Amino acid sequence: HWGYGKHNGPEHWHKDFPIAKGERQSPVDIDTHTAKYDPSLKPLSVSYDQATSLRILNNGHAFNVEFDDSQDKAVLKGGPLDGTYRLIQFHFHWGSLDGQGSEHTVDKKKYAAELHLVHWNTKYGDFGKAVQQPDGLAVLGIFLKVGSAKPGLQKVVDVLDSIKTKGKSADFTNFDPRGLLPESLDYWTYPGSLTTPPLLECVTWIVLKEPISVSSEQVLKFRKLNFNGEGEPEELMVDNWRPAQPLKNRQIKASFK
Numbered sequence: 001h002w003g004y005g006k007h008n009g010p011e012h013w014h015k016d017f018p019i020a021k022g023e024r025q026s027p028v029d030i031d032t033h034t035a036k037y038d039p040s041l042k043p044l045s046v047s048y049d050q051a052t053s054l055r056i057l058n059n060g061h062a063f064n065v066e067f068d069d070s071q072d073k074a075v076l077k078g079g080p081l082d083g084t085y086r087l088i089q090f091h092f093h094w095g096s097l098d099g100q101g102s103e104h105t106v107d108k109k110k111y112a113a114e115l116h117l118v119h120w121n122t123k124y125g126d127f128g129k130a131v132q133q134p135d136g137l138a139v140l141g142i143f144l145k146v147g148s149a150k151p152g153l154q155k156v157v158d159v160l161d162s163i164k165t166k167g168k169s170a171d172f173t174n175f176d177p178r179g180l181l182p183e184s185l186d187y188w189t190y191p192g193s194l195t196t197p198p199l200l201e202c203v204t205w206i207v208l209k210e211p212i213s214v215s216s217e218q219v220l221k222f223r224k225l226n227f228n229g230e231g232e233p234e235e236l237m238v239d240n241w242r243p244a245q246p247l248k249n250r251q252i253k254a255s256f257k
């Protein structure tokens with residue numbers, strides 16, 4: 001099955017998921033000089049004060065911090081969006097080296113990691129229905145650069161030892177995702193896809209221009225996770241990013257001048 005290795009990595013996915021060669025695939029390079037300022041773009045509305053985190057899971061390609069999405073608790077609105085999107089999970093993509101790891105790039109620059117806060121459009125009733133719709137998901141993407149530690153990330157880092165291998169999960173209640181956001185909510189936005197199989201073309205991408213800083217030790221502990229399950233040969237969970245895909249007939253808009 002699919003993964004990030006030489007024999008099952010992004011270059012192979014199209015054989016099981018032909019949409020990998022589609023017209024609105026993610027991630028993309030964000031050419032900041034070609035992205036046009038759109039003065040009609042509204043500010044983002046990130047309402048996370050009532051977020052209810054539940055669990056953290058090693059799913060064999062990343063770790064997901066999952067939320068209660070059975071009610072409107074943590075929601076994304078505004079920006080390019082119509083309607084209300086419920087937070088269901090966030091996860092990261094990261095590198096084996098500080099100089100790579102993000103999925104989106106900015107003027108071809110790669111960050112050490114990228115955070116994805118995944119939300120689904122409540123008008124479709126549940127997550128599984130939403131991913132079948134071209135406006136089903138809104139993913140808030142946030143770059144991570146290596147520098148000073150991010151205090152609000154440390155509770156995530158601390159628990160990774162307990163979910164080292166594929167299929168392990170741990171209680172993760174009372175985590176506040178507001179501690180993962182940068183100061184500014186200026187963003188770029190474009191229509192795209194899931195960056196992992198099934199690669200469905202259901203995502204409005206909202207990528208924050210301001211990265212967050214994490215410490216070398218924080219990302220180091222990301223890289224001690226495992227792709228494999230317990231009892232199998234150890235494969236470090238590193239370089240779980242898909243590279244930039246052709247922009248094709250899309251325009252990236254900027255919320256800011």
Ligand SMILES: NS(=O)(=O)c1ccc(-c2cnc3ccccc3c2)cc1
Nearest residue numbers: 116118131139193194195196197198
């Ligand atoms: N990396 S990303 O674009 O933010 C992202 C990628 C994939 C999913 C996801 C994962 N597994 C699925 C299984 C069945 C249906 C939809 C799925 C979506 C959810 C979010």
Ligand SMILES: [Zn+2]
Nearest residue numbers: 091093116195
């Ligand atoms: Zn992702």
